[PDB]
């Protein structure tokens, strides 16, 4: 029939501020109509790499829930938002499973997220004792112990604060420019699937 | 856990913090250089002090990780680079004295203004007031006046300053477990810990002498030819048996002989390869110059310039209102920001300089994947050599005909190749004995081989013995004749030009063999060759991660600097000079036969 109540993709993609990659925002999208052709046919995205599904049949298939994870990383760190990759972002900030079904959408945001003095409002975790599990969030701000001595909560020698700020200037290279990344995770569960595509008339 | 993992995490923290702090310092230095204003000077000084203080605090943190318990070569290289004390090992009073001495030598050299006694109402600075006189005058006593007056004022100011400088730098170097400051400079080529590819600080002097002994016949023939031509230019001053008078070499110090090309041209009747008029006729902007250079670098397979390069570089003189340094400089500011600051004119020299500085930019872009403290050349010679090879390839008549700047009906006979090779020898071969003699003199001064009361007696003795250049009148020890040059007065290593010159032709033979050029080496162009660009980029991507001996193995297949590619490059000119020197006498006499 005639379809209304579109899924809130404006509050994910067109958000005024994005989260840091260590504290990446997850929005659960349910009980609405998800039009994926609006995103795929946009010219504003640099990466639209879909894993486990093709973009053409997204607008047909139906899913139980959609997880929209949003964060900001560097240009050279977009490749680590993929199954099976290795780096600071994949190991310590945001880990994707190998058996991942969904799409990784990234675009350059040097216009918004870079200021002439330097935008240091975006943080990333630099050290953790072990690699993250898939879809894990670590927001702990406890001092990393690289040495045998106890840190005792103070950043001294062999003891570092694990969260480090991104330096974003508008004159940086494209591998250092900020990129807003939205990862959509599609799962089907035994509950009735309610996030369906638009139906043609 | 282990010491190596501790050092690796510390290096990660250092890299992340240092890259942003270095970017702030480099951006402040850029804003000073493109806009010379006092608040920009203050901002530059504040950023530089923050960067130096951060390096002091990180070196202090870095020393607590001992070197011999780390086995990974890259981690050990970054820790070796970070754990150098620098001037920090010296006492605070002596460190302040050394910094004050360096700054006041910089001000004396930069703001040194000299003019004729009894005519003091206006005076000429070194650039361009004295440079133009040295490069264009044909008068013996005018050039003699300019040379002696500038070495009188500058040397008599700088001699006690240099006497303090040598003692302070030797104290800092022996405090840093070096033999002298010369050993500290030779430590740039020191490779330790790699099996087979190790290079020692003491091997550098032996290799430089061994290469210069093979340089010497070509330089002797070139010196005899230049002596005969300068005898024609100045009839009575120059002797057939003696050295060249010092103030007649076309530059202030004798650094290059390229301003004697008009006097010493073999075949003036034949045309030149000057393409200046052709670009003026086609209205080539400096933007077009850099785009043609970019076309050259994409033809060989190297990456093209970033968008930030075209947006943020200053490739034209800004105007009267905005002040900028005119010297062409390629800037690796950090965080993927690459810029060129050049006041580009429509000349061949500026076009070749654009190729040279974009070669510097390509070298900087290639090791951007490396860690921050390994983002350098493998030695100081490679960084300049990779720009000079682009200057070699772009200057060829094949490249000029290919891009349309030269007429397709230009006749390339042997005479034009001889005079082009002679111009390249006056630029390239003529700087080699001057460079070697200057570095050997500075090494003997730092080593204590030359006492302070005997600096000039030895120096002119070295110049007569090596460079074949005689002083016009004798100088006592109140003069400081070496420190009138930019690099020695401002604490810069000088062997980088000698090593650059040899690495230039070694890289040229390697890339021309890669490009399958089948003629003379000076007729070779490395455009359109993907494999030559790949062989170049294999070394370019390493940066300082690998030893320079291994990088040289990656390019030319040799573990050491070699002199035979240079001699192969100038072999037609060498045979021509041997033919032309039948009547004249090759070699010089160290006696005072021309003038003293
Ligand atoms: C987000 O912003 C872009 C750029 O203005 C716009 O084209 C687009 O319609 C907006 N909304 C979505 C859902 O992408
Ligand atoms: C150079 O400095 C002057 C003085 O502050 C300033 O007005 C001008 O905008 C600067 N030039 C540029 C290109 O920023
Ligand atoms: C040295 O460390 C780097 C990362 O810091 C690593 O990629 C490289 O493989 C290591 N080399 C060796 C020989 O362990
Ligand atoms: C730096 O200076 C300190 C203080 O003298 C010294 O302990 C350390 O060994 C020096 N580092 C090197 C590499 O010489
Ligand atoms: C550099 O090369 C790439 C690929 O050939 C091209 O897409 C890009 O537009 C080039 N850069 C510029 C500034 O033209
Ligand atoms: C150029 O070649 C011709 C023909 O062999 C010869 O006569 C002439 O001397 C050569 N010129 C030079 C400078 O060698
Ligand atoms: C190099 O390639 C360009 C593009 O095809 C061509 O115009 C140029 O003539 C080539 N250079 C030579 C020397 O053939």
């Amino acid at each position: 029939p005639n379809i209304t109540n579109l899924c809130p993709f404006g509050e994910v993609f067109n958000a005024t501020r994005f989260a840091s990659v260590y504290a990446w925002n997850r929005k659960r999208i349910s009980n609405c109509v998800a039009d994926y052709s609006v995103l795929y046919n946009s010219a504003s995205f640099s990466t639209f790499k879909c894993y486990g599904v093709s973009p053409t049949k997204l607008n047909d298939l139906c899913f139980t829930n959609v997880y929209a994870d949003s964060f900001v990383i560097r240009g050279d760190e977009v490749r680590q938002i993929a199954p099976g990759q290795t780096g600071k972002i994949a190991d310590y900030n945001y880990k994707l499973p190998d058996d991942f079904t969904g799409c990784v959408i990234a675009w350059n945001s040097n216009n918004l997220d870079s200021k002439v003095g330097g935008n240091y409002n975006y943080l990333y975790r630099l050290f953790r004792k072990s690699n993250l599990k898939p879809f894990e969030r670590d927001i702990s701000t406890e001092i990393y112990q690289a040495g045998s001595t106890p840190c005792n909560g103070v950043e001294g020698f062999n003891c570092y604060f694990p969260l480090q700020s991104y330096g974003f200037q508008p004159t940086n290279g494209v591998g250092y420019q900020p990129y807003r990344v939205v990862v959509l995770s599609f799962e089907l569960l035994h509950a009735p699937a309610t996030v369906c595509g638009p139906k043609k008339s | 856990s282990t010491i190596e993992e501790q050092a690796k995490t510390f290096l990660d923290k250092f890299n992340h913090e240092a890259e942003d702090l270095f970017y702030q310092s480099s951006l402040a230095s850029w804003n000073y250089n493109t806009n010379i204003t006092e608040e920009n000077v203050q901002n530059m000084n504040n950023a530089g002090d923050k960067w130096s203080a951060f390096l002091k605090e990180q070196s202090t943190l870095a020393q607590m990780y001992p070197l011999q318990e780390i086995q990974n070569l890259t981690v050990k290289l970054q820790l070796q680079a970070l754990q150098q004390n620098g001037s920090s090992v010296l006492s605070e009073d002596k460190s302040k004295r050394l910094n004050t001495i360096l700054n006041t030598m910089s001000t004396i050299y930069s703001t040194g203004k000299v003019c004729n006694p009894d005519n003091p109402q206006e005076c000429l600075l070194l650039e361009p007031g004295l440079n133009e006189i040295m490069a264009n005058s044909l008068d013996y006593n005018e050039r003699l006046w300019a040379w002696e007056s500038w070495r009188s004022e500058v040397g008599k100011q700088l001699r006690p300053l240099y006497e303090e400088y040598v003692v302070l730098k030797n104290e800092m170097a022996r405090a840093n477990h070096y033999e002298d400051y010369g050993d500290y400079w030779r430590g740039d080529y020191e490779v330790n810990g790699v099996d087979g590819y190790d290079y020692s600080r003491g091997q550098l002097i032996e290799d430089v002498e061994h290469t210069f002994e093979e340089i010497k016949p070509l330089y002797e023939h070139l010196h005899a030819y230049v002596r005969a031509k300068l005898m024609n230019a100045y009839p009575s001053y120059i002797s057939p048996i003696g050295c060249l008078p010092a103030h007649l070499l076309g530059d202030m110090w004798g650094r290059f002989w390229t301003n004697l090309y008009s006097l010493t041209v073999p075949f003036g009747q034949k045309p030149n390869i000057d393409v200046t008029d052709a670009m003026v006729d086609q209205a080539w902007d400096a933007q077009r110059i850099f785009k043609e250079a970019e076309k050259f670098f994409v033809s060989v397979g190297l990456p093209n310039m970033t968008q930030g390069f075209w947006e943020n570089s200053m490739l034209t003189d800004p105007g009267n209102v905005q002040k900028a340094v005119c010297h062409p400089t390629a800037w690796d500011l950090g965080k993927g920001d690459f810029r060129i600051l050049m006041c580009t004119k429509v000349t061949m020299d500026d076009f070749l300089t654009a190729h040279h500085e974009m070669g510097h930019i390509q070298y900087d872009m290639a090791y951007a994947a490396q860690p921050f403290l390994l983002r350098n050349g493998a030695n100081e010679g490679f960084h300049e050599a990779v720009g000079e090879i682009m200057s070699l390839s772009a200057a060829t008549p094949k490249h000029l005909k290919s891009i349309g700047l030269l007429s397709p009906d230009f006749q390339e006979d042997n005479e034009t190749e001889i005079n082009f090779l002679l111009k390249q020898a006056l630029t390239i071969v003529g700087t080699l004995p001057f460079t070697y003699m200057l570095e050997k003199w500075r090494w003997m001064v730092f080593k204590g081989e030359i006492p302070k009361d005997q600096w000039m007696k030895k120096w002119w003795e070295m110049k007569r013995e090596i460079v074949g250049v005689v002083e016009p009148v004798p100088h006592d020890e109140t003069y400081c004749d070496p420190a009138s040059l930019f690099h020695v007065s401002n604490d810069y290593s000088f062997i980088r030009y000698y090593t650059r010159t040899l690495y230039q032709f070694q890289f040229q033979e390697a890339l021309c063999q890669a490009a399958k050029h089948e003629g003379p080496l000076h007729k070779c162009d490395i455009s359109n060759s993907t494999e030559a660009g790949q062989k170049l980029f294999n070394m370019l991507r390493l940066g300082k991660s690998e030893p320079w001996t291994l990088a040289l193995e990656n390019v030319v297949g040799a573990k050491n600097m070699n002199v035979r590619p240079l001699l192969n490059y100038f072999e037609p000119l060498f045979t021509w000079l041997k033919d032309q020197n039948k009547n004249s006498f090759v070699g010089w006499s160290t006696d005072w036969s021309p003038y003293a």
Side-chain angles (χ1 to χ4, degrees), chain B residues 59 63 67 80 83-86 88-89 175-177:
Chain B
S59 181
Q63 293 177 335
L67 268 173
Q80 271 174 10
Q83 277 185 2
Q84 274 177 335
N85 268 267
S88 87
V89 65
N176 274 332
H177 308 114

Side-chain angles (χ1 to χ4, degrees), chain B residues 100-124:
Chain B
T100 307
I101 279 162
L102 288 191
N103 288 267
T104 190
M105 289 182 183
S106 81
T107 62
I108 284 184
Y109 181 74
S110 180
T111 75
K113 63 183 290 293
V114 172
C115 61
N116 200 320
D118 291 333
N119 296 115
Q121 65 271 17
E122 83 262 12
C123 289
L124 305 151

Side-chain angles (χ1 to χ4, degrees), chain A residues 95-108:
Chain A
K95 179 70 187 167
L96 276 183
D98 310 341
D99 59 357
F100 168 67
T101 56
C103 301
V104 171
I105 314 157
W107 64 98
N108 189 283

Side-chain angles (χ1 to χ4, degrees), chain B residues 362-411:
Chain B
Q362 287 274 358
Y363 196 77
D364 289 339
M365 293 177 71
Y367 54 71
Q370 297 292 322
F372 171 78
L373 200 55
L374 284 190
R375 286 178 204 162
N376 271 274
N379 56 10
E380 54 176 25
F382 288 171
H383 198 279
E384 313 273 345
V386 304
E388 294 264 343
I389 60 170
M390 315 312 172
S391 177
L392 278 186
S393 298
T396 60
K398 183 158 53 180
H399 188 259
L400 303 177
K401 285 169 177 285
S402 164
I403 71 183
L405 271 190
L406 195 64
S407 66
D409 60 28
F410 180 76
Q411 183 60 256

Side-chain angles (χ1 to χ4, degrees), chain B residues 123-164:
Chain B
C123 289
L124 305 151
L125 263 77
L126 191 62
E127 166 75 13
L130 274 303
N131 274 17
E132 178 265 336
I133 304 181
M134 291 305 288
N136 301 81
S137 176
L138 272 301
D139 186 27
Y140 182 86
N141 62 303
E142 185 177 3
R143 293 171 65 90
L144 175 55
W145 155 77
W147 192 87
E148 286 270 331
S149 64
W150 169 270
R151 267 150 178 83
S152 159
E153 303 306 322
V154 177
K156 287 201 280 202
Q157 289 169 31
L158 285 182
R159 171 69 181 248
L161 276 68
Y162 208 73
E163 287 182 353
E164 295 293 326

Side-chain angles (χ1 to χ4, degrees), chain B residues 41-112:
Chain B
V41 180
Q42 274 315 309
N43 177 32
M44 178 177 50
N45 292 1
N46 293 340
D49 292 339
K50 291 176 56 173
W51 176 238
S52 66
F54 174 76
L55 259 67
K56 277 188 49 66
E57 290 205 6
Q58 290 308 286
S59 181
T60 290
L61 284 193
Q63 293 177 335
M64 293 178 71
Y65 300 115
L67 268 173
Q68 66 270 17
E69 281 84 3
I70 296 170
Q71 282 61 34
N72 191 359
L73 193 151
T74 59
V75 177
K76 187 174 182 178
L77 271 183
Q78 307 172 236
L79 194 68
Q80 271 174 10
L82 198 43
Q83 277 185 2
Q84 274 177 335
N85 268 267
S87 60
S88 87
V89 65
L90 191 62
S91 69
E92 198 42 80
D93 178 36
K94 293 183 182 294
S95 297
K96 201 170 58 66
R97 188 61 212 276
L98 189 57
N99 201 12
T100 307
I101 279 162
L102 288 191
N103 288 267
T104 190
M105 289 182 183
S106 81
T107 62
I108 284 184
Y109 181 74
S110 180
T111 75

Side-chain angles (χ1 to χ4, degrees), chain B residues 295 299 398-399 401-403 525 527-529:
Chain B
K295 276 166 50 172
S299 83
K398 183 158 53 180
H399 188 259
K401 285 169 177 285
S402 164
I403 71 183
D525 179 337
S527 196
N528 310 93
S529 180

